[PDB]
């Protein structure tokens, strides 16, 4: 089992020095966004409180190193720095997780990928789609096996840019902007066009 580890670092020139970091990368801001709600309060991502945790402690080390602090104090800071970078990379992995307000575990980097909610099973293997809708179903003994009753309301929003196309074709609207207005106001013309 040990060889399976050591043999993988020998083959590719892939240095094992990587398992110790001197500089940690910071994920782009729009992937850890900070947004103002309509209530005036702000809503931020959890990575911003963990990045903030690391930087705050890392800088404090710089101060304590410079001031020639005793090892007892310096080492403590070092240790917290380890638990900080760890808590960011994988929270809860070693010890108790970092709790935000209300004893809630913060979402770590690795948490963005894990399980059902993880980026994988929830954003790649199955996404959400445009040009789609949903409603209750009802029996229709009148329809043939290749047919289905689609509500006049559902279809108009489903084929919305296909209807806007033919509205300006047959000059009911003068452009694409006004043809949009026709469909939204639900002018009596569009029920013939959509058919």
């Amino acid at each position: 089992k040990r060889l399976k580890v050591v043999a993988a670092f020998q083959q590719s020139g892939n240095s094992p020095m990587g398992m110790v970091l001197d500089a940690v990368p910071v994920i782009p801001p729009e992937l850890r966004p900070m947004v103002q709600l309509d209530g005036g309060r702000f809503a931020t991502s959890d990575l911003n409180d963990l990045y903030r945790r690391v930087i705050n402690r890392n800088n404090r080390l710089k101060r304590l190193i410079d001031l020639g602090a005793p090892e007892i104090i310096v080492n403590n800071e070092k240790r917290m720095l380890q638990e900080s970078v760890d808590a960011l990379f994988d929270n809860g992995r070693r010890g108790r997780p970092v709790t935000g307000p209300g004893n809630r575990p913060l979402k770590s980097l690795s948490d963005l990928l894990k399980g059902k909610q993880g980026r994988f099973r929830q954003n790649l293997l199955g996404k959400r789609v445009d040009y789609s809708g949903r409603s209750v179903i009802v029996v229709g003994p009148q329809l043939k096996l290749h047919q289905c009753g689609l509500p006049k309301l559902m279809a108009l929003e489903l084929f919305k840019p296909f209807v806007m196309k033919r509205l300006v074709d047959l000059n009911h609207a003068q452009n694409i902007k006004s043809a949009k207005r026709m469909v939204e106001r639900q002018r009596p013309q569009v029920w013939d066009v959509l058919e």
């Binding site: 966004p33 931020t44 409180d49 809630r104 909610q117 840019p161 452009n175 694409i176 902007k177």
Partner: protein
Amino acid sequence: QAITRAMADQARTIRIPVHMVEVINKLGRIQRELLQDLGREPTPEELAKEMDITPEKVLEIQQYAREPISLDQTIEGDSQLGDFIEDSEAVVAVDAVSFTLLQDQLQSVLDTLSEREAGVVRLRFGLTDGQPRTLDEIGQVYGVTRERIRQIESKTMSKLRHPSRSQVLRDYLD
């Protein structure tokens, strides 16, 4: 001293300066003082007069103290607040498409207009440029001087009335 200082300095996810923190803690102090005096939580007007005598800032202070919440926090299989936040940045499909069709209408204007006429149009408005150059430079950077380029401007403003009388530009303003 160092604890209180560092605390007010680091605890806020959005940093507020030292004096600002001092204000809020004085506002929480006078509030608790007026809290046992009036048997009720004091009105904004009441609190203001006592400490800073300004009602408008107290409302503002009480928003600064409001601590932010987490996007990743949830309500439900999976709540996740961030799954409701609409991306106000992304481009509307129809609105981007209609702008492009407005470019097909200004291409049918560079034509009816002369080459001198469709010249100043793209000069001071900056279509291909992206910048609106000063007119006393435009007339001098164009091979034709005596600011003839402002003379050709009026030779176009009414030439634009015809595609405005065709109303094909009248529809895109409403």
